[PDB]
Symmetry: C6
Subunit: 261 residues, 6 copies
């Protein structure tokens, strides 16, 4: 057993993906890297059509072990992104995708990789994503990743960590890509705020004030500070008898201090 | 068993809530978020009446797992707020509320969540608040929170922590809202001081001096520094044979150093 | 058993209290808070006579659990103050006071609190002070404090700690008052120096030099630096064949470096 | 047993070596030092032909125990370099080279060194490289290194570490050479970027912008930041329907923050 | 048993005391405090003859528990001072003094204190010094100190520690005096250098250069840096065929870096 | 047993000593201090011939326990110096010297000291050096050192440590001399570079550039940075087909970053 396996495409995953705001770049990179890892021919074909004289442009990208690391601040949506991104990959490559979430550790890791290899052999018609929410056992994991990379099996591994320095170096150096979730920049803060406040009549000038109030002005808000503190506070301040007040929303953002690093 | 369960509304909880000063914003956010978690229709109805064209305004707020984190300085009143806020929620939603305070840990957490689910099924006529004063066991807690969120059961979890970084990331990322208790700003210091000094003849100009003396001028007083050090010192300085002296109260505030971070 | 129980008033406690210099404010606050905790009516009566319109002035002070925390630098006299202050409380309230000093920990704490409750029931004619020199067991202590607070029993707890951050948060948040012992300010340094040097012919101008030499000029002397280093050095420098020399006393103070934080 | 032994020359090692960019200096030093350790006569002959009057020029280099330490940032390619560099040494000295990768620890280290000595005796027609990926056992390792150094056996040891301070001092002081992998300088960043972007039509002026955007401007990108984050992001941004856009590549580099030390 | 007990006066202790340079103030304070602890009447008599109107001048000094703490940098001579200072006390008070050096810990401490009490009862004709070179057991030590203080027994305790913060607070607060050994000031550096260089023809101007070269100019030499590094280096530089050269001595002092804090 | 005992003089030790560059001062101090410890009469005789009126000039140096501490950066050559310096002492005093290198710890230390005492009694015709490469057992070591010091036995102890603060204080305070190996100053860097580059045609002006490039300009190269990184890199850069190029040597030194403290 594993945990709760999901297949893609999925209406609920798509809805959850859509609800992630300010992560558009992280979505695109995670989705496209996964597509390359399971179907590397698509990257080779893109290279030939657009840059045929390119010698090392993709040579580095293709041969990487099929592991993607999501690293950064807690509460940024890393896990929620990893659990739903397979819907995007399924759309992008037009394949059906089985997600295996990994919930004595050495036995568990081996088993997970053995199952992943077996299912990938049965399947490029489809693909298999192994998801690891943590964190002898490191060696079982390394051997598993290498085994997926040695073969042409349509399989990839996503692993989430709060701090990339927590990861064993032999795991880190095998990541085909590391995607970082640090404090949102002005554009990312703008997207979360605009998307959330749409249809409330908040002007663009008032949005920029909240963008500035949540920036470093010297560290800014985390993604968590926006989604789990500031957004609820703004909504609840008006609920249930009042419309959203930009002056109060700004006063809330300014009095609120960011999570310290 | 749990500890000492309370039902709301309660005269003593209301009195205790009222005695919490400088926490008006924390009370409102905690009370309203809890109301939304147990009765999400009220937020949807508010959205339609005031912002019908809003697409993602509340979509994020409603679907959150029903967990609220109170994080920040020790002695701010977090626990006292969590133990009494159910009286406010009962008033706001006109419901009767059962509070279950959580006092081998994995068994305890499972049992608490199983009981909470059962009682919530019996009950939206009423609601059930599970309170956690801390801090395998993390997994039991996560499974419990998800189970409350999966259902439409009128139940929520409050948990208090001194530092949010202490919390397991898989707990933190599930908080529907994080409410922070850091050092009171000038308005919050003014409210504690004014409310406490009311009827003593202290002028507003003298209140502002004490507000300034307890601010960063570079960190200011904590809530604890106001309620457990400065307020007793001011009162005891006059007790039992003298009226309150603003000059002495200011001298006390200025000589007193804030709790270091 | 406990340790060595003392009754108040006591000639030796009074003498020891008197020998504590530079702690006049700490004595007054500790003594008056204890009087309020055992005889809360005296605070209510003071409030009515002097500030009858005051609504929340004492409402916060009275309802606090009967615990007082003494926190700060080692060697400041915290323990010596806690062991003798009951003589002051006995004088202030005209009551006889039994001090129980607390010297498997969970059993010890429960027993101490059970004994304290029993003796307080026998006794407001008198009062009982439980003294804790440190530091499951935390839970026994919390339950004990709440039990003393729930009743009208004339009993209070004093506990000493070097750093208040060492204390469990559930202990800290129950303190009715926290009294801090940090580095003496210019007035406190003046009182120790003047009182010690009285009758030696040291001028006030020479006292101010020693006050300045022991200040931050950027941290100053601790109370320990004054009583366990500088004062002996000044006396021994003259002993046994010479009178006290202000020039040498200043040279000693200036060459002596304060205890680093 | 060991792990997976490789012989050199090898087409796949050569390909992997070639794919390492920005490490040209590290390759040359590692390759040449290894050649000297197995065939010290070549260094003596070079010294005589070019600097015959040199007395201590090579006297220090030759007599060193045959250990080379690769130290520095995770994900720089240290391991990949150590696993393939034997192809370069084989070419440089025209010898066949057996690589023994080292996967109860004291027994393992002794055995590895005993095997290495035996094979080196059979073999200067060829050479033996012992590779150590980590990290009583330290003593077995020291004894092994000394034993290789005492003899004229054509054998050397490569060991990789993230931080050289992690290594036992008795290991560190025996390194014939320490080769460091820290943050690439402007030339090294230029080589990675130019080599990767060749044939995409990116101008030299646009390359310099990306060199500047990945420098300290105050720490710069690591090698990992270039190969596992920035390079994939640039490629995936265009893939699969668009050619590489220098403006987007610069915007990506600038918004991306380096790995903190 | 203990270790090696010494009686005073002793020719070898006197010689060792004399060889300690730059500690004149520490010697005087340690010697005089010990004399007061064993013969407190001498301090009272001094007070009456010189400052009869002094009320609290010595009241604090006399009543202290008979413990003296020597705290500060390793290699300052603290231990050597504590092991020989009894010769000075014997001279100052004209008494014979038995030193008991303290080499399951709780039993050892109790026994040492029981023996010390017994011998002090037999003895003010003489006195007993207990010496502790470190560092349940803390409680045995506290009980021992209090027992010596409660009685009029002619006995004192010296304990040495590198950092006073290492000591248990209940030990620290009982010290009658704390004597600190930190980095020598200009006068102390002058005394070590002058005394050592006497009879070598080094001018006073050249001594001041070495005083300046060993000062902070921002921390200066420790006592260890003078006695265990600089002094040997200066002597050995001339030994065995050359006289002491002030220019070389200065060059040595300046190139030598102080021990970092 | 011990490890591998060496006798002096030794041709190989002399060669190894000669190969240590930039340590001339450390060699002289270590060699001369050892000579004094085994033959203290030579220091007394030097004092009389050159400074007969000197009273405390050597009184401090002679009476020290016979222990010398070598402390500082790893890879400076401390161990190599300690293992070969006995050849210098043998030459300086014209004696034959037995070196005992120390490879359940309490038994080992006692045995080593008992053997050292026995051999020294058999031997001033000769001397015995005990060498300790690290680091109850501390007490065995202290007792051993004192025993060597109490007697007139021609024996000394050398111990090496990376950080002197690692040593037990009771060991540190017994060192007759502490000799420190920190980052080479400009003269020491000049000697390593000049000696290594002799006969290569590198000008003095080019040497000064490399001296400046390896200095703090704010910490400079360690001895390890010179001998295990920069020197190999300079040589290997020319090997095997090119003469040494000062321009390349400078470029290498400047791009190379020192080991961080």
């Amino acid at each position: 057993l594993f945990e709760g396996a999901s297949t893609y495409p999925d209406v609920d995953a798509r809805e959850r993906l859509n609800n992630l705001v300010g992560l558009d770049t992280h979505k695109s990179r995670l989705s496209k890297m996964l597509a390359v890892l399971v179907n590397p021919d698509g990257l080779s074909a893109w290279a030939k059509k657009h840059h045929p004289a390119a010698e090392a442009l993709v040579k580095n990208v293709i041969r990487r072990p099929p592991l993607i690391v999501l690293a950064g601040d807690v509460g940024s949506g890393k896990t929620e992104l990893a659990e739903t991104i397979g819907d995007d990959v399924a759309r992008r490559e037009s394949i059906r995708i089985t997600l295996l979430p990994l919930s004595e550790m050495t036995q568990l890791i081996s088993a997970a990789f053995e199952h992943t290899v077996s299912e990938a052999r049965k399947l490029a018609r489809g693909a298999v994503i192994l998801l690891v929410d943590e964190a002898a056992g490191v060696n079982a994991f390394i051997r598993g990743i290498d085994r997926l990379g040695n073969g042409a099996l349509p399989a990839a591994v996503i692993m989430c960590t709060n701090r990339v320095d927590s990861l064993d170096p032999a795991v880190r150096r095998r990541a085909a890509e590391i995607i970082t979730f640090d404090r949102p920049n002005d554009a990312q803060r703008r997207a979360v705020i605009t998307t959330t406040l749409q249809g409330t009549g908040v002007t663009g000038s008032q949005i920029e004030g909240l963008v500035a109030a949540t920036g470093p002005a010297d560290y800014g808000f985390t993604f968590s500070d926006l989604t789990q503190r500031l957004i609820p506070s703004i909504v609840l301040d008006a609920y249930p008898d009042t419309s959203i007040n930009p002056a109060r929303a700004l006063a809330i953002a300014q009095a609120m201090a960011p999570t310290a690093p």
